[PDB]
Amino acid sequence: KAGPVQVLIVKDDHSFELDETALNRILLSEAVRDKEVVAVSVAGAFRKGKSFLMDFMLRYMYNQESVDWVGDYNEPLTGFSWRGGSERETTGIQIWSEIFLINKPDGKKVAVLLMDTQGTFDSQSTLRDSATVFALSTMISSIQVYNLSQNVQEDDLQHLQLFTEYGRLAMEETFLKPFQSLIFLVRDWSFPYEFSYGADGGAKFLEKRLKVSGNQHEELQNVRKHIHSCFTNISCFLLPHPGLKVATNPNFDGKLKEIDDEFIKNLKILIPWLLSPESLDIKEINGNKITCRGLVEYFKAYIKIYQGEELPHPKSMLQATAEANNLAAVATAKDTYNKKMEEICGGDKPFLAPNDLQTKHLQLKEESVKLFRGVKKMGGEEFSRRYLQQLESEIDELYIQYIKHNDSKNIFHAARAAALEH
Amino acid sequence: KAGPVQVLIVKDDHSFELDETALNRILLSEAVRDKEVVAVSVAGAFRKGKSFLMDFMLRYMYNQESVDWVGDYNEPLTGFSWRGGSERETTGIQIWSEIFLINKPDGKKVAVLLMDTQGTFDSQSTLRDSATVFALSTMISSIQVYNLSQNVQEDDLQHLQLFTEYGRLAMEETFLKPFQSLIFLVRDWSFPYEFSYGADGGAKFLEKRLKVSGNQHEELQNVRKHIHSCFTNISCFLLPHPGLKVATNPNFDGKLKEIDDEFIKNLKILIPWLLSPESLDIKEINGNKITCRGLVEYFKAYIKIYQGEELPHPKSMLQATAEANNLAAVATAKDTYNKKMEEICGGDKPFLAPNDLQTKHLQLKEESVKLFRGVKKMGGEEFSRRYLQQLESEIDELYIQYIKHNDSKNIF
Ligand SMILES: Nc1nc2c(ncn2[C@@H]2O[C@H](COP(=O)(O)OP(=O)(O)O)[C@@H](O)[C@H]2O)c(=O)[nH]1
Numbered sequence: 001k002a003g004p005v006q007v008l009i010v011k012d013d014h015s016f017e018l019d020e021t022a023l024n025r026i027l028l029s030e031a032v033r034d035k036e037v038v039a040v041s042v043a044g045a046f047r048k049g050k051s052f053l054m055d056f057m058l059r060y061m062y063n064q065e066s067v068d069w070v071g072d073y074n075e076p077l078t079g080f081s082w083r084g085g086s087e088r089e090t091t092g093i094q095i096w097s098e099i100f101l102i103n104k105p106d107g108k109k110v111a112v113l114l115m116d117t118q119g120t121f122d123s124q125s126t127l128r129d130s131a132t133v134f135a136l137s138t139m140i141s142s143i144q145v146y147n148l149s150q151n152v153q154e155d156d157l158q159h160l161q162l163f164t165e166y167g168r169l170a171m172e173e174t175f176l177k178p179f180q181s182l183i184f185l186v187r188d189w190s191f192p193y194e195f196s197y198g199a200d201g202g203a204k205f206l207e208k209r210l211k212v213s214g215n216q217h218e219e220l221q222n223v224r225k226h227i228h229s230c231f232t233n234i235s236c237f238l239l240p241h242p243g244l245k246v247a248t249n250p251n252f253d254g255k256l257k258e259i260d261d262e263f264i265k266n267l268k269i270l271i272p273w274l275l276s277p278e279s280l281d282i283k284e285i286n287g288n289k290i291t292c293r294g295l296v297e298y299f300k301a302y303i304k305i306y307q308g309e310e311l312p313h314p315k316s317m318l319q320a321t322a323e324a325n326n327l328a329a330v331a332t333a334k335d336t337y338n339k340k341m342e343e344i345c346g347g348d349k350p351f352l353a354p355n356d357l358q359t360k361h362l363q364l365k366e367e368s369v370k371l372f373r374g375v376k377k378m379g380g381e382e383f384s385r386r387y388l389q390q391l392e393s394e395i396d397e398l399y400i401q402y403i404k405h406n407d408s409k410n411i412f413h414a415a416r417a418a419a420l421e422h
Numbered sequence: 423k424a425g426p427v428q429v430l431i432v433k434d435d436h437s438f439e440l441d442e443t444a445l446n447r448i449l450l451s452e453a454v455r456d457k458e459v460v461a462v463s464v465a466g467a468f469r470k471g472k473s474f475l476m477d478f479m480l481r482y483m484y485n486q487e488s489v490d491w492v493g494d495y496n497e498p499l500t501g502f503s504w505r506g507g508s509e510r511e512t513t514g515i516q517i518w519s520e521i522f523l524i525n526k527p528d529g530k531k532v533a534v535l536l537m538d539t540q541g542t543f544d545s546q547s548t549l550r551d552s553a554t555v556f557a558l559s560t561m562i563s564s565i566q567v568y569n570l571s572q573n574v575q576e577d578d579l580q581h582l583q584l585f586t587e588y589g590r591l592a593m594e595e596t597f598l599k600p601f602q603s604l605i606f607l608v609r610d611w612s613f614p615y616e617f618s619y620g621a622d623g624g625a626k627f628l629e630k631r632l633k634v635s636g637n638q639h640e641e642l643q644n645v646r647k648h649i650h651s652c653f654t655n656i657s658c659f660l661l662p663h664p665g666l667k668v669a670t671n672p673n674f675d676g677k678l679k680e681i682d683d684e685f686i687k688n689l690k691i692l693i694p695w696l697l698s699p700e701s702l703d704i705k706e707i708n709g710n711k712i713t714c715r716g717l718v719e720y721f722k723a724y725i726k727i728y729q730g731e732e733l734p735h736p737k738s739m740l741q742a743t744a745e746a747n748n749l750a751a752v753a754t755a756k757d758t759y760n761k762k763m764e765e766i767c768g769g770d771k772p773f774l775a776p777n778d779l780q781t782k783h784l785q786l787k788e789e790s791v792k793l794f795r796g797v798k799k800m801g802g803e804e805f806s807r808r809y810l811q812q813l814e815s816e817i818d819e820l821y822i823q824y825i826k827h828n829d830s831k832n833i834f
Pocket residue numbers: 045046047048049050051052053081082083084085088089090119187188239240241242246247252
């Protein structure tokens with residue numbers, strides 16, 4: 001009996017491991033291994049109805065032939081595990097064990113994989129944990145449903161940019177756009193009088209929200225240019241609130257009779273719109289169409305990169321900023337010291353007695369330390385102590401080099417001093 | 423007639439302006455200027471009902487004596503401008519023109535100021551615009567209501583950390599915690615069966631959300647330690663959804679009869695829990711209780727710090743990481759060059775023919791350029807061309823110094 005399969009595991013020590021046996025058992029099966037593959041993923045903030053949606057997608061895939069694919073109104077919703085409560089349910093990445101075989105209008109059979117993901121920004125996870133799940137799901141999928149709550153805020157665009165950038169960095173260089181299709185799915189859209197529920201209102205809303213203008217602040221332009229540059233297709237669907245029973249009643253178990261009718265009406269537009277054979281494009285990577293076995297090879301490779309390579313890993317903005325402020329201040333303080341020692345013991349300057357040089361070095365070092373402490377930086381003095389230590393250390397190193405140069409100007413200084421003394 | 427007054431103006435060019443005439447007119451009046459002041463702000467993500475809430479706070483402040491301060495169920499909600507639609511309404515910072523005079527159980531008569539703020543993360547705003555509004559409201563207020571939707575996610579904690587840190591940086595050094603009271607107000611809380619609506623459920627929920635344990639990753643511990651360190655008091659209230667009509671009906675005008683009764687029930691607890699005379703903490707800055715006159719002075723002083731460039735301004739996560747990656751790569755590439763040259767022309771190494779020195783330098787500089795280009799960084803060569811050129815220039819400076827050392831070895 002078909003069921004959800006855990007394929008990417010995130011360990012408690014925040015390491016990532018792929019379950020190759022489970023992945024192979026699904027995608028290396030003889031019936032599907034050489035078939036071209038379509039992969040549909042959902043991703044976004046945690047506790048926002050992603051798995052719930054995926055389970056409705058499952059009903060469609062299993063019942064496309066039916067006049068009533070949505071089902072009997074008294075049936076519970078099953079598949080990927082979903083529930084209320086404020087703590088996350090889905091972790092890592094899971095896929096449905098049954099690969100669906102679809103006929104494209106074109107010709108023969110292509111395979112469809114459904115991927116469910118750990119929601120971002122749960123309190124068990126580092127930023128890197130969230131970035132990795134999101135990036136990988138994006139890199140694997142041919143269609144990414146980016147699930148949001150109520151609105152598309154500027155912080156949402158920044159996260160999307162950061163996560164997709166993390167993915168792209170791990171990919172083969174290509175002059176083509178790295179990904180294919182992205183859907184901004186807004187749950188609980190509250191203003192149908194302003195933009196209609198569905199894909200057209202959604203398109204109109206997003207066209208405005210994402211428009212790149214040369215006159216906007218660079219920060220607003222750049223997040224928008226990045227998102228447009230990552231995907232060949234970007235669309236948006238506005239969905240109504242499902243009603244307060246879905247949201248708040250602990251006995252709710254997914255029965256349509258307990259879901260707002262306007263939601264159901266739009267759900268019935270949304271799912272076939274996402275999953276119709278004509279809209280389902282075969283996954284491509286670096287200009288090549290990929291098969292099921294080929295998709296497994298990429299999953300392994302992408303995981304290995306995240307495990308083994310120097311990648312710039314995502315940092316919280318305070319952290320990122322605190323690091324930048326500190327590195328900049330170290331550079332300046334060090335440069336000031338060096339320039340001033342150069343005036344004193346650069347190559348075109350006379351030899352200095354070791355004690356005079358030490359005195360000059362100590363003064364200048366102190367001046368650079370005082371300068372470094374003076375610069376306002378995010379993170380506090382506690383965050384800066386390591387950098388202060390680094391600055392004093394690098395200055396001492398510069399001094400050592402200076403001594404060697406200074407000595408070379410008068411090797412006999414001490415020997416001659418001792419002879420003259422007597 | 424009382425009304426909302428625009429006090430911090432945020433212009434289209436992302437510049438900030440204080441309306442001093444307006445601010446002075448409110449807080450320097452004879453009746454209030456010498457009163458100790460309580461300042462209540464609400465802040466957080468845009469389009470989440472902050473102004474709506476403030477307007478219910480206003481009904482309470484005008485009718486604290488009544489059992490039915492919440493109002494006639496047919497009366498519309500007025501005050502700070504609030505409305506639906508996907509575009510922001512409130513910009514900058516507004517205050518209510520009428521300062522309320524309240525008697526604390528103490529005997530201490532105090533002034534109460536209400537602050538409404540531009541929601542963060544709207545599509546017109548730089549990160550710096552959102553940080554400035556949030557930081558200023560937090561630096562000025564004695565009670566900050568941090569308004570959130572549905573849940574308290576890790577990204578919410580990170581934004582709070584960035585914003586409050588930006589605030590602390592514009593403040594005078596202090597041996598005390600920088601801020602006083604913070605309330606995490608979760609709108610549309612959906613899980614009363616897990617944690618009850620209200621302050622008690624809220625407290626249990628937040629205690630778990632913010633608890634620091636030795637088993638936590640450092641990144642998670644650190645956001646929490648920072649937040650606990652910023653505020654003298656941290657609380658949390660879980661509020662039910664007000665109903666789909668409040669959210670979706672374009673003709674809804676704030677009448678209680680159109681608001682879910684359970685929301686109303688919890689609202690009626692929430693407001694006096696926030697604003698009752700015992701709950702009103704007098705604003706303190708660096709250990710001194712502040713008056714209305716004093717608060718005006720800090721408002722001007724704080725804004726002036728934000729108006730200038732004497733502080734490091736926050737950048738988007740990609741941009742900030744991009745700069746960090748780049749500064750780090752400049753350093754590594756430079757140090758690599760320097761160390762190898764040192765091996766070749768350090769003080770304890772023999773004179774090299776000037777042309778040979780040039781040749782070795784050109785090689786080692788090129789190797790450092792490749793090293794720099796080789797390092798993966800967010801985001802793109804485009805962002806890095808500035809840093810690459812900087813790297814090459816600095817290497818050229820180092821070389822100039824090496825030539826002078828090498829030459830001096832042949833001074834004979
Ligand atoms: N407000 C709202 N709640 C939803 C929606 N769809 C599902 N839910 C509820 O969201 C909760 C979390 O569902 P789940 O699929 O596990 O969220 P996930 O963590 O993103 O996978 C469940 O209680 C669902 O009943 C929606 O569109 N709006």
